[PDB]
UniProtKB/TrEMBL annotation:
The chain holds residues 151 to 200 of 204 of the full protein. Belongs to the protease inhibitor I20 (potato type II proteinase inhibitor) family. It comes from Capsicum annuum. Disulfide bonds join 4-41, 7-25, 8-37, 14-50. This is Pin-II type proteinase inhibitor 38.
């Protein structure tokens, strides 16, 4: 069950970790108007944990 999403451009109130098991970050900007963040897909993140 692969997942395509980045912590930066994720959803406020969630968490995203890498594939190897290295947590990226949590509690990021909201989807409505997120701060300076990338647009491409982040395959590094296995899945989100909300």
């Amino acid at each position: 069950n692969r997942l395509c999403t980045n912590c930066c451009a994720g959803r406020k109130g969630c968490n995203y970790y890498s594939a190897d098991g290295t947590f990226i970050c949590e509690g990021e900007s909201d989807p409505n108007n997120p701060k300076a963040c990338p647009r491409n897909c982040d395959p590094n993140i296995a899945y989100s944990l909300c």
